[PDB]
Design a protein around this ligand. Structure first.
Ligand code: GTP
Ligand code: MXV
Ligand code: ACP
Ligand code: GDP
Ligand code: CA
Ligand code: MG
Ligand code: MG
Lengths: 316, 54, 437, 427
């Protein structure tokens, strides 16, 4: 029997996972503060990483990577990309982004394109620097709004892509084969959060990958793999590998795995851009069972065994 | 980077290497605390002996 | 030449001191009888080793050391051991019945009956010192004696020698080798009462020594002897600068200067490589670079914690054996590229290096093999606060119920002292968290 | 660090005799008091229970106490009768008639100072006396009433020493008289307040073990006492043989008793051994560890699954791998972490001793401070109230000076004890 503890009751994903682990009959859930756990589905905030891996006779795993927040908070993510050499200063796949605290770097580059007539619409989206900058004072990230998003028809709709990525204790990088396409139901006028019509063109403003592949073929004469997914695999891999020496638990007294959500926007020229990385992502309702079983298979049961895969290994 | 203040001798050497620059109670009070604990201990002992006398 | 006095308190202190003084005697070529032929200056001197030994008219070299246990069983083995002639009887002070794992019995009740005698033997040592610089105090956090009588002794030394440095070698409690359920209580209490009295403290988590023994020495069930021989290697690394020629960490003041910029944050992490089994038949000798790089693996630290998620305020490397500066700076330049080493903005990202050409000395019939080169790193990283968080959480679990509290109150203590010590610890964790994020 | 042993009453003296028999065979001391064994280990801590006499003879530090002469004449006639210091037989003549009042207020008051004189004369010749050990039942009169009187006196004279009792609890299955629930309840009031550790040996449990487990159809008191003496040797192994721990009464108390009145331990033994029946297959360490935590091996009839362990101490005896013992112990705690309180971290201590008990190559003794012990006290409380609500059999006590009030107070204190144990069962 294995033992495990839940300490984030909001996590839909790890609710799923704890239910699966229970229904294997080889896992038992403990009281939230029993230290004698094999596995910690831990909190989102102030997770007590200094307490793991000090229980004699207990292999401990946790579903978060200490340090990963530096990829999953807008300001720190931008910082990391600019400052780290693996990301090469201005790499090709991040929008121009700046940290301004509620300024000098923003003006120097932005006024060049305000003078050069090239579209100067950074992002709460405005074109006058003062209008949004002074408004933010009422930390924020100032990013270039890609004014040429990809046209999606019928409907002329803007969209974003979420891919779910699992990093296991060995630092394998697994991309879930099913990604999601969060569509905007209303057309675009020269924000796609499902939290903000809905349902006209496809169920719940969620377009899946088989469907989006067929659209890309029929409309644009290409494959999802070739046009978009290669760039997505390149970005996921470059990001996770920049921070590997800072977060890897290879020689540690406890072990980390973590599920990440990578958010991309594709422009009109079929180039892929990284919006944000999320450390606590929510799966799509159709995909919950499959992805959560995959977590159990490759992150949890790989360490705590019992007695074709749904992931692509991004090789490093 | 920059190696500084190297000192040698027949047992070894020492040096610094730099890579980046930067951006009480008295005896009186002790005896007071200890004796207060003493009085508390002797008082509890007396409460015991009183209970036993009852 | 300024003298240093060693004080070993309770069982852990006494047995670790044993291990250290035997190692020191092997290192300085001093025999089990107190004779050092190496010493041509007969009867005295002001040599570096004289920091730790005094000389008699009969050529006997005598530890500037006092052993102090509230019960006689352990110090009596010191009295009938291989090194019986080494110590003058007065140096070995023993009580009669112990502190029963109770901080308050060791501090208050049994403590006050022996504190004055200890202080007078310590003054008998101090009066044979031309220029005392301070004391090295060896003790456990979790014992009754090591906890309570140590904090009492520390307060008194502060008053009798207010100008002398005091360094701690402190054993942090680990359930694998544990002796009492209340050890978190004793730990918090003694830390809170000793803090302002202690200039630099080297913490040793019995968990870390234990796993090091099992993993790197292939010993399934480490005894105290294994743990203490290894511990004395690290201690000797840390004190060799006081017993030998060099320019780095030459007095106890320089330990605070180089390692402790803030007085409260005075717990430097020790890391030590290589720990290689004497039973390993074929062993490949590790390079300067391999052992320097081992210094940034947690599995070699005296306390398991993750320095990547903290900041550095200081960093020393003490090498012993075949080492040369060019190889050290080469290893450092390699490591900075590949590892997460962040300092505080108000400190220099730099390393203070100290090299002693003579390889680490090993006790014959031990578990450690000879190596051509070893290193002991002393880093003041905020990540050591992980130990405090652990301790404090355990303390909180018990204290929420006042479990065992009555044992303390029953020796004269007040519940208030518990809450006071815990608030001090919470402060300490907050200071660490501020410096480190 | 010497211990002074004291056995009082019929039951007191029988289990005590069996204890001294057992550990005297362990330490290689014959009935004439001479050492005829094969290891220095057997003497390294012989001072804890024996004094040295002329000619290198060993004499138990044991005071034998009764209000009747019968049982103690039986002890003298017994196989190890001659090993006891004759001066240390202190007896009255009238008896206590299974009556707590007689033991505590009338017949035992006459005798108690004489007992205390023999105590004193054993303490004065003790380099550093840790404390006292009492064996007695709680359902009769001498052991119950006079034993608790003695415990109160001794606490008066030696307030800073450890008081330790092995206390047989009464049960209707093994019952001499209907007034045992009275004698026990009065007794528990005393034990709650003047002892640091009390091993709750329940006669019910001993009977069930003898019946169900050892397949003895009609168990005597001798069989029940074989079990008690096994458990007592096991519990005291660490005082009597040297280990990594360097064991003593006070540190055991500190480590076992989070709250002063909750100091009543469930003992257990494994493997369960019938008298004389030889055990040919030694047990594996997993086996000792599963059995030792089995309810069928508990000497107090409580179901440990009905409560939570506050603290646990376990003692393994024999040549075995300490690695495997740690593995299995950690194993039990981690597989049943529900039944161990989480607000006392690392609340299970394990010691080992190389020397095994006579007859076995592998054995394990268990000392549990579980809240489930409330069951035992509840049982006595029920039996008590069933009579007391009709003031039945009270004349035996009021005739000796006692008043109904003292009974109501005793009942009330025990019900309080049950409430505390319950309080921490849900914390
Ligand atoms: N590393 C190491 N730890 C030890 C040694 N001896 C005891 N300990 C640890 O010390 C802690 C308990 O402190 P002790 O020194 O044994 O207690 P004490 O100072 O002798 O205090 P009392 O006996 O209670 O009066 C436990 O956590 C043990 O793990 C030792 O020789 N080496
Ligand atoms: C007098 O007899 C004995 C004494 C000792 C003992 N002696 C010295 C220090 C100790 N620390 C702990 C000890 C340490 C940590 C947790 C503990 C204990 C005890 C119970 N929990 C939960 N136990 C100790 C041990 C014995 O059995 C394990 C024993 O036999 C019954
Ligand atoms: N440079 C850019 N060009 C085009 N759209 C952009 C953009 N930067 C952000 N967006 C849009 O902003 C929307 C929401 O902003 P953002 O990426 O900061 O949070 P999010 O989409 O990941 C949801 P949440 O913040 O709740 O996790 C995205 O759906 C995306 O369409
Ligand atoms: N296990 C065991 N229990 C006993 C023995 N003798 C008596 N008892 C129990 O002790 C109680 C009677 O106490 P007893 O010692 O005979 O009374 P006392 O001698 O006047 O103090 C009853 O509950 C009996 O079941 C014995 O030899 N072994
Ligand atoms: Ca000299
Ligand atoms: Mg001790
Ligand atoms: Mg009878």
């Amino acid at each position: 029997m294995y033992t495990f503890v839940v300490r984030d009751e909001n996590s839909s994903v790890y609710a799923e996972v704890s239910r699966l682990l229970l229904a294997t009959g080889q896992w038992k859930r403990l009281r939230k503060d029993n230290p004698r756990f094999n596995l910690m589905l831990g909190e989102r905030n102030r997770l007590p990483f200094g307490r793991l891996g000090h229980e004699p006779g207990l292999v401990q795993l946790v579903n978060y990577y200490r340090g990963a927040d530096k990829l999953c908070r807008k300001a720190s993510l931008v910082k990391l990309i600019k400052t780290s050499p693996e990301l090469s200063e201005s790499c090709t796949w991040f929008p121009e982004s700046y940290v301004i605290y509620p300024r000098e770097v923003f003006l120097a580059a932005y006024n060049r394109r305000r003078e050069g007539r090239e579209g100067n619409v950074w992002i709460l989206i405005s074109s006058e620097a003062s209008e949004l900058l002074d408004f933010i004072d009422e930390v924020h990230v100032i990013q270039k709004y890609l004014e040429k998003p990809l046209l999606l028809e019928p409907g002329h709709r803007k969209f974003d892509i979420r891919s779910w990525v699992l990093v296991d204790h060995l630092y394998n990088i697994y991309l879930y084969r099913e990604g999601v396409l969060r569509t905007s139901s209303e057309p675009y006028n020269s924000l796609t959060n499902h939290c903000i019509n809905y349902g006209r063109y496809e169920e719940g403003n969620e377009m899946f990958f088989e469907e989006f592949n067929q659209y890309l073929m029929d409309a644009l004469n290409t494959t999802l793999e070739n046009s978009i997914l290669l760039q997505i695999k390149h970005i996921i891999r470059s990001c996770l590998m920049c921070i590997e020496p800072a977060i890897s638990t290879k020689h540690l007294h406890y072990q980390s795995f973590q599920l990440f959500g990578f958010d991309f926007m594709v422009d009109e020229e079929l180039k892929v851009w990284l919006i944000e990385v999320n450390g606590a992502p929510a799966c799509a309702q159709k995909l919950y069972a499959e992805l959560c079983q995959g977590i159990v298979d490759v992150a949890i049961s790989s360490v705590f065994p019992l007695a074709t895969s749904i992931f692509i290994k991004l090789h490093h | 980077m920059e190696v500084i203040e190297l000192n040698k001798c027949t047992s070894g050497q020492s040096f610094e290497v730099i890579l980046k620059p930067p951006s009480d109670p008295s005896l009186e009070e002790i005896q007071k605390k200890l004796e207060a604990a003493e009085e508390r201990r002797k008082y509890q002992e007396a409460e015991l002996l009183k209970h036993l006398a009852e | 030449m300024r003298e240093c006095i060693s004080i070993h308190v309770g069982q852990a202190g006494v047995q670790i001191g044993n291990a250290c003084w035997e190692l020191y005697c092997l290192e300085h070529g001093i025999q089990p009888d107190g004779q050092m032929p190496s010493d041509k200056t007969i009867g005295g001197g002001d040599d570096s080793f004289n920091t730790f030994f005094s000389e008699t008219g009969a050529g006997k070299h005598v530890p500037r050391a006092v052993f102090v246990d509230l019960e006689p069983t352990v110090i009596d083995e010191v009295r009938t051991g291989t090194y019986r002639q080494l110590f003058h009887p007065e140096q070995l002070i023993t009580g009669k019945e112990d502190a029963a794992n109770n901080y308050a019995r060791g501090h208050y009740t049994i403590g006050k009956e022996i504190i004055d005698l200890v202080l007078d033997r310590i003054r008998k040592l101090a009066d044979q010192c031309t220029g005392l610089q301070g004391f090295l105090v060896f003790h456990s956090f979790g014992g009754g004696t090591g906890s309570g009588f140590t904090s009492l002794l520390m307060e008194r030394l502060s008053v009798d020698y207010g100008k002398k440095s005091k360094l701690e070698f402190s054993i942090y409690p680990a359930p694998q080798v544990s002796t009492a359920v209340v050890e978190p209580y004793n730990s918090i209490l003694t830390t809170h009462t000793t803090l302002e009295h202690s200039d630099c403290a080297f913490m040793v988590d019995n968990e870390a020594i234990y796993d090091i023994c099992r993993r790197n020495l292939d010993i399934e069930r480490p005894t105290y002897t294994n743990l203490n021989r290894l511990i004395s290697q690290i201690v000797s690394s840390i004190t060799a600068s006081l017993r030998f020629d060099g320019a780095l960490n030459v007095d106890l003041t320089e330990f605070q200067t180089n390692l402790v910029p803030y007085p409260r944050i005075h717990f430097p992490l020790a890391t030590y490589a290589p720990v290689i089994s004497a039973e390993k038949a074929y062993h490949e000798q590790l390079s300067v670079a391999e052992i320097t790089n081992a210094c940034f693996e947690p599995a070699n630290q005296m306390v398991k914690c993750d320095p990547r998620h903290g900041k550095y305020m200081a960093c020393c490397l003490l090498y012993r054996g075949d080492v040369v500066p060019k190889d050290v700076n080469a290893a450092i330049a390699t490591i900075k590229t590949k590892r997460s080493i962040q300092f505080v903005d108000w400190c220099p990202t730099g390393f203070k290096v100290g090299i002693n050409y003579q390889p680490p000395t090993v006790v014959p019939g031990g578990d450690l093999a000879k190596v051509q080169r070893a290193v002991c790193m002393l880093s003041n990283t905020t990540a050591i606060a992980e130990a405090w968080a652990r301790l404090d959480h355990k303390f909180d679990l018990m204290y929420a119920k006042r479990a065992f509290v009555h044992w303390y109150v029953g020796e004269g203590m007040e519940e208030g002292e518990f809450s006071e010590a815990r608030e001090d610890m919470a402060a300490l964790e907050k200071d660490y968290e501020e410096v480190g994020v | 660090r010497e211990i002074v042993h004291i056995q009082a009453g019929q039951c007191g003296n029988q289990i005590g005799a069996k204890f001294w028999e057992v550990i005297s065979d362990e330490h290689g001391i014959d009935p004439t008091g001479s050492y005829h064994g094969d290891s220095d280990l057997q003497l390294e801590r012989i001072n804890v229970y024996y004094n040295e006499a002329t000619g290198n003879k060993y004499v138990p530090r044991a005071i034998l106490v009764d209000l009747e002469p019968g049982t103690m004449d039986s002890v003298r006639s017994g196989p190890f009768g001659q090993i006891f210091r004759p001066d240390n037989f202190v007896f009255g003549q009238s008896g206590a008639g299974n009556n707590w009042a007689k033991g505590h207020y009338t017949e035992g008051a006459e005798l108690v100072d004489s007992v205390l004189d023999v105590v004193r004369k054993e303490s004065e010749s003790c380099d550093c006396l840790q404390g006292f050990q009492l064996t007695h039942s709680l359902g009769g009169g001498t052991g119950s009433g006079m034993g608790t009187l003695l415990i109160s006196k001794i606490r008066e004279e030696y307030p800073d020493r450890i008081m330790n009792t092995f206390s047989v609890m009464p049960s209707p299955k093994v019952s001499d008289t209907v007034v045992e629930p009275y004698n026990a309840t009065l007794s528990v009031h005393q034990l709650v307040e003047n002892t640091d550790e009390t091993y709750c040996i329940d006669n019910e449990a001993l009977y069930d073990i003898c019946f169900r487990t050892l397949k003895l159809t009609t168990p005597t008191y001798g069989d029940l006492n074989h079990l008690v003496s096994a458990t007592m040797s096991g519990v005291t192994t660490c005082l009597r043989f040297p280990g990594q721990l360097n064991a003593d009464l006070r540190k055991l108390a500190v480590n076992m008793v989070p709250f002063p009145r909750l100091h009543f331990f469930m003992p257990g033994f494994a493997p369960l051994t019938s008298r004389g029946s030889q055990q040919y297959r030694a047990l594996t360490v997993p086996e000792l560890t599963q059995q030792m935590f089995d309810s069928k091996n508990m000497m107090a009839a409580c179901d440990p699954r009905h409560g939570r362990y506050l603290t646990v101490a376990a003692i393994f005896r024999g040549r075995m791998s300490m690695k495997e013992v740690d593995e299995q112990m950690l194993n039990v705690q981690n597989k049943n972490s529900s039944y161990f309180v989480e607000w006392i971290p690392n609340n299970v201590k394990t010691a080992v001793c190389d020397i095994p008990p006579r007859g076995l190559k592998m054995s394990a003794t268990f000392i549990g401070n579980s809240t489930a012990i409330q069951e035992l006290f509840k049982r006595i409380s029920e039996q008590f109230t069933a009579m007391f609500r009709r003031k039945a059999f009270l004349h035996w006590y009021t005739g000796e000076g006692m008043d109904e009030m003292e009974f109501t107070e005793a009942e009330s204190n025990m019900n309080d004890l049950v409430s505390e144990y319950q309080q921490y069962q849900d914390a």
